Chains A and B, each alone.
With several copies, the nearest count.
Chain A
């Protein structure tokens, strides 16, 4: 019934293309298209890991109590902004052992909703109500890179990189839940297969993107640097 333009750029046109690609369109159906899209995006971001949904940010360690941000889903490289240094993640028992038994390497763990560090780190960041003030990040400022949970659509004008990069993915993953809402199985299976194929293509692209500029050959690393 409804019309739509060639590019599905925004939520407003996606919620109409959904009803178009499925003639099952009416009052009792269009009102829940938002819920189907919500379920589809949740099913997507639950396991999708790609750059465009990443986010880098400084942390405040406070030697221990340092807390995990709300948007934490998976941690990428973690380091500082001074001469470079990469942390490695270990288990709580290793850190508890390091505490008593005893600074080039630095470890960390995940205690519930915290990030513990064996050394008494003193990373500094501006407080909450600070107005602007980039602060010219001081030293001992760790920078964390992780995968952040993207926002949920709340306005027809609201757009997202997924719409501009792969709208068919959302359209199929939401037609799945649509054909589930109504009684239909063939469409469910076909849309699920197509969405899974698109997601596989995207993750394979991400894979072929990483470490894709030259071959590798470990040069028999046996710690040439031992003197220190």
Chain B
């Protein structure tokens, strides 16, 4: 999936995965953006195996 986190409106990004090995990427192609990222906090659960 892919979502845009515009600052001042959204407080998070909603993604739905259940793979055991996650990977996240961040892209900033805007011209009028001077944002920054101090840290994240992922919400996740635990399913099973095999």
Contacts and interface: CB of A to CB of B under 8 A. Distances in A.
A/B touching: CB–CB < 8 A: yes
B10 A182 contact: no
A28 B47 contact: no
Given A26-B3, A28-B1, A183 B45 contact: yes
Contacts of B50: 22-23, 182-183
Contacts of B14: 23-26, 29
Nearest to A188: B48
Interface residues of A, number: 15
Nearest to A187: B47
Contacts of A23: 11-12, 14, 16-19, 49-50
B14 to A, nearest CB: 4
B15 interface: yes
Contacts of A184: 47-48
Interface residues of B, number: 17
A24 B11 CA distance: 12
A24 B43 CA distance: 12
Contacts of B1: 1, 26-28
A182 B3 contact: no
A185 B47 CA distance: 8
Interface SS of chain A: helix, strand, loop or mixed? Answer: loop
B48 A24 contact: no
A179 interface: yes
A26 B48 contact: no
A185 B1 CA distance: 24
Interface string B1-37: 1010000011110111111000000000000000000
B48 A179 contact: yes
Contact of B47 (A1, A25, A26, A182): A182
A184 to B, nearest CB: 4
Contacts of B16: 23, 26, 28-29, 182
Contacts of B17: 23
Interface string A179-198: 10011110100000000000
7 contacts: A1-B1, A23-B12, A24-B19, A26-B3, A26-B16, A27-B1, A29-B14
Interface of B: 1, 3, 9-12, 14-19, 45, 47-50
